[PDB]
Design a protein around this nucleic acid. Structure first.
Lengths: 35, 114, 138, 415, 225, 365, 316
RNA sequence: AUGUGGAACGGGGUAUUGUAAGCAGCUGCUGAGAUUAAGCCUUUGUUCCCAAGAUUUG
RNA sequence: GGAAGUCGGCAAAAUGGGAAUCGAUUCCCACUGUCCCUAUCUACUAUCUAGCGAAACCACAGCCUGGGGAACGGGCCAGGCAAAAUCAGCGGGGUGGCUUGUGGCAGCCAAGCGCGACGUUGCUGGCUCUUCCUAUCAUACCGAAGCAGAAUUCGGUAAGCGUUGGACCCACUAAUAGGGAGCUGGGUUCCUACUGAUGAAGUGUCGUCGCAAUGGUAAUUCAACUUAGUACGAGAGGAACCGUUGAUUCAGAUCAUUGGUAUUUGCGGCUGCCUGACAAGGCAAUGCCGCGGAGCUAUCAUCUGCCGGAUAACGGCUGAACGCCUCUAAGCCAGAAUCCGUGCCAGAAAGCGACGAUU
């Protein structure tokens, strides 16, 4: 099985970070940031 | 999520605490701590071990019955449909058990003192 | 393919208490009495580590005492009971008072028909056939 | 008999290169003259032995994967007869086995002489003398290895037959509608072309009917193809499906087809033939009809009419030769079956899933379907424990009444 | 008669239980199984995505009919509360303090008659008759004690082992007042209960069930109309 | 000659030297990457390991073997009283690294942070920051100049914050002072945020929010000098190389546990912090009889999954994860069902004395 | 080893050849054996010794699965050791004669459970004597190798009924570290017909049940978990077996009942058990003790035993 | 280096064991008694002690 | 769990014993830290201190790499390097640029200079251990093949990471690939290194908070759910990518729960001993037994193990050389578990910055 150094695994991990899967962290940061 | 009752001391058994033992007759025993588990291994009768609630209630050292509030507790094998009004006033009945049982707990020991 | 053959679900890590050379009770009505552990499936490359099995693991078993025609096959066996205490993922610690197992084919349906004694739910979940033919599942 | 599992045979050069490369790569390579003579002898002995082991390992793989013509069902044995000349195939396989034994003999001989090697050189040439003889042995079966590879390639193409199961052999004149009948009956995509004898070899196709599966084997029309067709019906518990061109639109005369069927009747015996009138839409036949076993079913090949009836008749002939009130809900009587394409079809949790992230991401709400006096509380958390007691032991629809009765009682005790 | 697979397993009786008033499916795996059940019974009876004791063998752990449902001792309070909330009011649920926890293996019960493991407890038999409202009979199937796993029951038909004799066939039919056929499910597997779940108007079997077997179940269960 | 029977290396070469950490406080060797798209927010906090317990939570993990079941997990309780911001440090990027250009301190420094500057507070004349306080009172235009310098030249803004160790039931009186990098916004925005946060307390309620994934860093427990057996896991003419396992220090090393989940951030002023929606039963996070060797938790606390490095009453640093990692374990919510507060000093059997008193009879005392 | 060196020097193909010749020297059987059939002939050392020692022109047969190197006067049969075809060739070569001595050298592959290997050839020797007793003449001899195990006594028992004399021994060339024994079964009984009990191995290796288990020791010592690995009471579906109270009182095996039964019940339906229930001698402590037999101590068992004796005094 | 100061004891809580001696009449006092930080928690409790000696430092 | 350890029941536990063969061997039962797999407890030593106080050994000493014809060595050559004084451990240090994958005899050619190359034809030692190499068994990615699918064969880059448990045998495993540079059996009759621990010293002094040159580096494999009974296939059979869940091995932590440990000698019980007696306690080289907090600990318990560039095999774009073509010559794109960083550990005790006070 491909490891974590895999360039593919890095690529779709980047794809996850490119979409709303990290938008739950943006608004999460904004909540404390505003309060 | 059930706070079971130990087989040996008859005390509460919370999650994580204690041991579960399954016998070949599919009977399940729950032990709250290592003291009760090892005592069960040596097969010491709870009715003849002093520090057990089973001994205390079977030796006259604890109340014969407490029909507190016309109903105190049972192992209900028929589930009941969830209601708020039922769930809130039974939350209150919980407490009303506690003071009444606490009151009778004071009265019984005061009687046993003399 | 025997390794996780017809498991219908992953197993959680469980305390290992039945290594190889273990002698353990047959639990089915097929006629076998005692089993001897020869090897366990799914053991990797660990130096000096003795291969071991838990509840619901599939092992290679030899019927030491039992019916002669039941013997002379290194038959797959499912460990259904274990004396060593193990942590169920919900938190409770469990241990049956004897080490028991069933004679099964590599596919995952046993030669027996009814299980005498308690059956671990981990065993009954990785092996629906044992669950189907179990009498009491705990 | 799935002949596809035979490993591919390298030509003599690649075989030698693979063997020698494996010997070089897997065995140690460096030795010095100053080493103890025992280590020198062991060094070259390993290479000779390792090369022997690689060669037999490959040669045995061939000898085991090929089917033993004697031990197999005589349908396939005779089919391999007409296609491959069992004697040539048997000679080719025996040559490899004789080679295998020769490779073993040379290696045993040279390992034996190596025990007496006195210098790094005299061992070096026994090893060179060894491997060369091993190689020259292999180079002599160039024809046998090439022949077996060709046989292998065509073997992997043959259909997987099973005479044990119920069958219905279809044979007749070339392009006489038998291919059309096979295509209409079975899912097999048999090519139909104006060129005669388009079906060079046999074509096996399964068909489900009468709660059973029958393997219809279409044979070449009637040469090597004709011989293979004859052997196909030679050993098979099946019925003949002869198709005679009623209108002669297939290019074959009806009288000629009848004469051919009468001549082939000796091999078609013990079977329920069919007197198919092919190309119905597009005298001599009296003698064929006099047999009785042949079923005269019209086959309008141009209009594709009667093919299903003929197939059903043939299948039937082959089979012959071989208080509890169930209160079903009213909605069940008018329930529309869930078929995806229709718009009236309701939704399923499977479709909610693909919309809401698919497998592993969508969290199914277990609580979403509770029969409950409200849809809002539908996500509430019911208290389970309170002050050492479960809330569950006390959930009673009249529990308020027990509490008021009680009130009165405590008010009595305080007084 | 339909063909379905839970995950990639031919045993759907183990992972689901079906009655004439409700359906129960395993939780936590693929809901494709729940999706298939809803496709045929969603508009007829409720389908409950439930587990019993944090376990997916609910089919062989719980036995029930169109009237009542039974759960073993290992059933958690939360799951029991979940089942009560999901199922409609006219259906009653009961915990059983039975040594033989596998209710689905020891009890094979239709709407009117149930045949039980021979060594069942008297208190279990009494509460079964009270809740299920069926006549209970202690007998073995083909000399085999697991009646629920080795026999499938419906209102109009039932199946048993092919190993049973003709006189055992007649006796079982006479004691059950329902047509009974000796057969097999999932291509030669003699666990009829594990491979088949049947209500009074539809049948589910594993995808590996042969066409001949499906015809047999359809013939005995009269489901063509 | 080759090794006959091979095994993987008995140790890890990435954690040596196995020497004693040159620090007692967990160092942040990496702060999360900055971004001007997001304005101001902190990135770290400092707490004390009070003790650890176990909880029961309903696991909503789609696709899991135990989806929608009750699970038991060990949890670590770290008391996190609010920390006072007393300084700001500007860092300028140079071809030689990040260099601290200047530092600005708040006017009023508590004795808590003043004790950090002395090895003996009582003998000292307490002269630290006195002239700084004088110049702060006299002329604020000077301090405005360093802040102008920070917002004009510096690229990284960090705030010096010290923990109110007085609030914790610790025998230590020195406050732990560290730098938390202000991530987000322009350098001017960070400088302003530091200014309006001078002398005020920043709490864990504003730093972390009960669901995110953090890195917990600290110094591990000390096991003393140990032989090759327990230090390393041990069962041609040359000189001994560094790779050979040897006998030496085992324990008290700086470690970093990644991917720790906060199950709960509770408030000290609230008396329901140990109670959940499935439990009621008014109680506090402190177990019956107090935490073993720590005391009673009376301030804001954080409950992490698993175990964290170091023994009780040791200081831990909690930082935001450097890299986003959207594993569904890191993205799922947590709904606590029950928290264990029985006596950890022995085989405890009761959650609170209130509910112990009904079961037990009337004690003579 | 030394015997391997002797074999390679002299020409014999195995140390087992030296084992055979030493056995022939001490027992003096093969020299008079006109018809010798050797099963599992590999590697052929037995055949070489037999051909050399015996008078040329005898009926020497060697049957094995591997290619048997043609041994002089030894018809070599490369087939299964008990194939229908191979038995046909044995009969075809036997003709009017009958088997006099059947040599056997069954050696299955080792590398599995020791019980498997020992029991594995045990049927292979058992099967080989089946074909032997098919082919033997009256007074014949059957010689082979067996590893000792729990089935070794049973195999020798079957040998005792099927042959007049048994002379099992171990030669010096045999590796004493291993557990092999050379059994020599001479004086063939020559029965009227081969008994189905002997032929069919269900009745041969059937486990002979032993006397009652030492359960009173466990009764007297409820502690000391002794790792019970025997089985489950010969197909006992429910392990919560209960014993009638009146039956236990009237029984003559109280220790066995306590050691086997898990509970003693006092049914209300039975009038005698109800009378025992209402008896003043039966107390609540005894009632709870007998309600859970397995969780009971030495004192409780002794109290129960005294109680049953007191009831025995009362009823008669 | 006079402080929400420290220390020695004491109380309470929490734990370990199992119901003490004695008074008595197995039972009651008595889930009592004993131990409890030596690397458990707490203290409006009492008592006591510290605003000292030496050394190196531009 | 019960000899799975070892050449082997060496030694302990069963109290040593039951049956066979010749005291030995074997077998079945029995027992157990030999082992999986180590953990805990006690005493002594080692540690420090007061006093006393040696000996062996000693040309001088003390870092490594390549070379010094040899004998390479420590002194010589060329490099890496190199900062006082020390402490406790452990014992390391006291002969071809060879070689590898393709045998021997004869003839026919014949590029060419009597030979004559390739061809072509004729015949019979094992138990544990650090690191390195690739000449790759598995894992990653590619090309070819009747390669439909699945499974597979060969070949290329590739040494990052694994390559077991038992008596050549039989299992597991993804695989059980090949080699280089403390110990025991049958067979012949000081100093230096390594590992931890202090430590004087510029920078005025003492501190607090930091920076980061450099050195080390870590994660590995499997199967489970859909995607599927779909692509493909007459059928038999039947995958993949995205997403998700567990487990094997390894690594780093932790002690809520569970087990273990008992000098808490904490409590209780039993035997014997000690004052006339009711009692009262105390004693027995840790008298014996049960429980036993705290601590320690267990893949016997729980937790945690991540992303950016540059490439190799290889697939392409434009495009000449060579008016065509061309992945290459100038340039460009995609591309492997690979290399380099990030992250993680250490922090130059002769690298540094900011701040505080300053007798």
């Amino acid at each position: 099985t491909s490891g974590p150094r895999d360039n593919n695994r890095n690529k779709w991990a980047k794809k996850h970070l490119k979409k709303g899967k990290r938008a739950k962290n943006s608004n999460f940061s904004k909540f404390l940031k505003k309060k | 999520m059930r706070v079971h009752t130990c087989y040996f001391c008859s005390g509460p058994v919370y999650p994580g605490h204690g041991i579960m033992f399954v016998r070949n007759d599919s009977k399940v025993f729950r032990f709250c701590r290592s003291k009760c588990h090892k005592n069960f291994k040596m097969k010491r009768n709870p009715r003849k071990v002093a520090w057990t609630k089973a001994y205390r209630k079977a030796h006259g050292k604890e109340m014969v019955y407490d029909t507190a509030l016309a109903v105190t507790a049972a192992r209900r094998n028929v589930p009941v449909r969830y209601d708020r009004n039922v769930i809130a006033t039974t939350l209150n009945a919980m407490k009303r058990v506690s003071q009444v049982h606490a009151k009778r707990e004071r009265l019984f020991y005061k009687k046993r003192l003399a | 393919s025997r390794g996780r053959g017809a498991a219908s679900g992953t197993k959680y890590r469980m305390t290992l208490g039945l290594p190889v050379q273990a002698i353990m009770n047959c639990a089915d009505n097929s006629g076998a009495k005692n089993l001897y552990i020869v090897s366990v499936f799914g053991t990797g490359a660990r130096l000096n580590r003795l291969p071991a099995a838990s509840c619901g693991d599939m092992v290679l078993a030899t019927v030491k005492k039992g019916k002669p025609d039941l013997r002379k096959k290194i038959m797959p066996a499912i460990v259904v009971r274990q004396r060593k205490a193990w942590r169920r993922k919900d938190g409770v610690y469990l241990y049956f008072e004897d080490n028991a197992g069933v004679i099964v084919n590599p596919k995952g349906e046993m030669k027996g028909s009814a299980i005498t004694g308690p059956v671990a739910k981990e065993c009954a979940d990785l092996w629906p056939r044992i669950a189907s033919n179990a009498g009491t599942v705990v | 008999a799935v002949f596809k599992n035979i490993t591919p045979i390298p030509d003599v050069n690649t075989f030698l290169d693979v063997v020698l490369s494996r010997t070089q790569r897997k065995t140690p390579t460096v030795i010095r003259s100053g080493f103890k003579i025992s280590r020198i002898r062991g060094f070259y002995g390993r290479k000779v032995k390792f090369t022997q082991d690689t060669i037999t390992e490959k040669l045995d793989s061939i000898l085991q994967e090929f089917p033993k013509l004697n031990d197999i069902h005589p349908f396939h044995a005779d089919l391999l007869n007409i296609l491959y000349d069992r004697d040539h195939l048997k000679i080719a396989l025996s040559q490899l086995s004789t080679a295998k034994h020769l490779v073993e003999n040379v290696a045993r001989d040279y390992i034996r002489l190596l025990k007496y090697g006195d210098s790094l050189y005299r061992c070096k040439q026994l090893k060179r003398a060894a491997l060369g003889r091993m190689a020259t042995i292999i180079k002599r079966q160039k024809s046998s290895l090439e022949f077996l590879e060709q046989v292998r390639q065509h073997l992997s193409r043959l259909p997987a037959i099973d005479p044990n199961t119920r069958t219905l052999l279809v044979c007749g004149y070339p392009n006489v509608g038998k291919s059309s009948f096979m295509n209409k009956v079975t899912r097999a995509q048999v090519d139909v072309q104006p060129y005669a004898f388009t079906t060079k070899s046999l074509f096996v196709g399964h068909f489900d009917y009468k709660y059973l599966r029958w393997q219809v084997i279409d044979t070449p029309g009637i040469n090597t193809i004709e011989m293979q067709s004859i052997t196909a019906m030679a050993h098979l518990r099946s019925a003949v499906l002869y198709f005679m061109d009623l209108s002669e639109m297939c290019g074959y005369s009806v009288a000629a087809q009848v004469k051919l069927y009468h001549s082939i009747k000796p091999l078609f015996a013990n079977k329920v033939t069919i007197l198919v009138l092919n190309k119905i839409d597009a005298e001599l036949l009296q003698t064929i009809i006099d047999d009785g076993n042949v079923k005269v079913v019209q086959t309008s090949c141009v209009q594709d009419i009667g093919v299903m009836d003929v197939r059903t008749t043939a299948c039937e002939a082959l089979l012959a030769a071989r208080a509890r009130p169930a209160c079903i809900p009213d909605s069940v009587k008018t329930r529309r079956a869930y078929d995806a394409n229709d718009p009236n079809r309701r939704i399923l949790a499977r479709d909610i899933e693909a919309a809401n992230g698919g497998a592993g991401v969508y969290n199914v709400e277990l609580r979403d379907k509770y029969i409950l006096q409200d849809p809002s509380w539908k996500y509430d958390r019911m208290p389970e424990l309170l002050d050492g007691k479960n809330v569950a032991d006390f959930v009673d629809p009249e529990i308020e009444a027990k509490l008021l009765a009680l009130d009165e009682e405590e008010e009595r005790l305080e007084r | 008669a339909l063909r379905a697979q839970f995950e990639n397993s031919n045993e759907i009786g183990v992972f689901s239980n079906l009655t004439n008033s409700y359906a129960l499916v395993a939780l936590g795996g693929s809901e494709n199984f729940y999706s298939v059940f809803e496709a045929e019974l969603g508009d007829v009876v409720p389908v409950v995505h439930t587990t019993i004791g944090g376990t997916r063998i609910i089919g062989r752990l719980t036995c029930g009919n169109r009237k009542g449902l039974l759960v073993p001792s290992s059933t958690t309070d939360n799951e029991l509360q979940h089942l009560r909330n999901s199922l409609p009011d006219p259906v009653k649920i009961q915990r059983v303090d039975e040594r033989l926890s596998a209710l689905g293996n020891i009890v094979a019960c239709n709407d009117y008659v149930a045949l039980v493991h021979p060594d069942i407890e008297r208190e279990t038999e009494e509460i079964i008759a009270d809740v299920l409202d069926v006549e209970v009979f202690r007998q073995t199937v083909a000399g085999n004690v697991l009646t629920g796993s080795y026999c499938a029951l419906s209102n109009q038909g039932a199946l048993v082992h092919p190993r049973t004799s003709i006189q055992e066939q007649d006796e079982l039919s006479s004691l059950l007042q329902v047509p009974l056929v000796a057969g097999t499910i999932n291509r030669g597997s003699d666990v009829i209960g594990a491979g088949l779940v049947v209500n009074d108007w539809c049948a589910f079997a594993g995808l590996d069930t042969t066409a001949t077997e499906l015809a047999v179940c359809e013939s005995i269960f009269k489901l063509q109309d | 000659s080759h090794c006959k029977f091979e095994q993987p290396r008995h140790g890890s070469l990435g954690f040596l030297p196995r020497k004693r950490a040159s620090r007692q406080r967990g160092k942040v060797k990496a702060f999360p990457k900055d971004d001007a798209s997001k304005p101001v927010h902190l990135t770290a906090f400092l707490g004390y390991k009070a003790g650890m317990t176990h909880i029961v939570r309903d696991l909503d993990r789609p696709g899991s073997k135990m989806h929608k079941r009750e699970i038991l997990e060990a949890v670590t309780v770290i008391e996190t009283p609010p920390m006072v911001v007393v300084g700001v440090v500007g860092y300028v990027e140079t071809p030689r690294g990040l260099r601290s250009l200047t530092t600005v301190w708040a006017e009023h420094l508590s004795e808590e942070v003043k004790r950090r500057f002395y090895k003996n507070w009582f003998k000292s004349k307490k002269k630290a920051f006195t002239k700084y306080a004088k110049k702060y009172a006299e002329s604020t235009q000077s301090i405005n100049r360093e802040l102008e310098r920070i917002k004009k030249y510096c690229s990284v803004v960090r705030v010096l914050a010290h923990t109110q160790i007085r609030k914790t039931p610790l025998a230590q009186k020195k406050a732990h002072l560290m730098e938390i990098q202000v991530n987000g916004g322009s350098v001017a925005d960070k400088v302003e945020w530091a200014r309006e946060h001078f002398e005020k307390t920043v709490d864990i309620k504003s730093t972390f929010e009960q669901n995110e994934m953090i890195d917990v860093i600290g110094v591990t427990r000390g096991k003393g000098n140990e032989g090759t057996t327990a230090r390393w896991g041990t069962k041609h003419p040359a000189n001994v190389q560094w790779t050979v396992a040897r006998a030496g220090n085992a324990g008290y090393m700086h470690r970093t546990q990644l991917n720790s989940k906060i199950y709960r951030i509770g408030a000290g002023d609230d008396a329901k912090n140990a109670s959940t929606d499935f439990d009621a039963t008014e109680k506090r996070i402190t177990p019956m009889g107090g935490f073993v060797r720590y005391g009673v938790v009376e301030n804001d606390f954080v409950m992490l999954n698993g175990a964290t490095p170091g023994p009780v009453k040791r200081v831990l640093t909690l930082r935001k994860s450097l890299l986003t990692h959207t594993s569904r374990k890191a993205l799922e919510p947590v709904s606590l069902k029950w928290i264990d507060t029985a006596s950890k000093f022995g085989h405890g059997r009761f959650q609170t004395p209130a509910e112990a008193k009904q079961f037990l009879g009337t004690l003579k005392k | 080893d030394k015997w391997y060196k002797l074999a390679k020097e002299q020409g014999y193909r195995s140390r087992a050849a030296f084992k055979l010749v030493q056995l022939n020297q001490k027992y003096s059987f093969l020299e008079k054996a006109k018809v010798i059939i050797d099963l599992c002939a590999a590697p052929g050392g037995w055949l070489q010794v037999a051909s050399k020692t015996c008078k040329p022109g005898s009926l020497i047969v060697g049957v094995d699965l591997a290619p048997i190197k043609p041994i002089p006067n030894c018809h070599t049969f490369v087939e299964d050791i008990t194939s229908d075809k191979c038995r046909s060739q044995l009969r075809g070569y036997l003709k009017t004669w009958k088997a006099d001595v059947v040599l056997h050298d069954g050696a299955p592959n080792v590398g599995s459970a020791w019980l498997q290997d020992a029991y594995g050839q045990a049927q292979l020797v058992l099967m080989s004597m089946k074909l032997a007793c098919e082919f033997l003449v009256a007074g014949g001899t059957f010689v082979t190798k067996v590893f000792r195990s729990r089935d070794y006594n049973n195999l020798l028992w079957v040998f005792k009924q099927l042959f007049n004399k048994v002379e099992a021994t171990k030669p010096p060339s045999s590796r004493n570290v291993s557990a092999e024994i050379f059994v020599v079964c001479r004086g063939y009984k020559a029965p009227k017909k081969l008994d189905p009990r002997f032929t069919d191995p269900r009745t041969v290796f059937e486990e002979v049940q032993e006397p009652v288990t030492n359960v009173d020791a466990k009764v007297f010592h409820p502690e000391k978990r002794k790792r019970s690995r025997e089985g489950y009471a010969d197909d006992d579906y429910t392990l919560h077996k209960t014993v009638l109270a009146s039956e236990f009182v009237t029984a003559n095996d109280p220790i066995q009942i306590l050691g086997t039964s898990a509970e003693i019940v006092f049914p209300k339906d039975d009038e005698e058990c109800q009378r025992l229930y209402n008896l003043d001698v039966t107390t609540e402590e005894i009632l709870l003790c007998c309600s859970d037999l397995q969780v009971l101590g030495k004192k409780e068992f002794r109290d129960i035993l005294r109680w049953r004796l007191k009831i025995r005094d009362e009823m008669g």
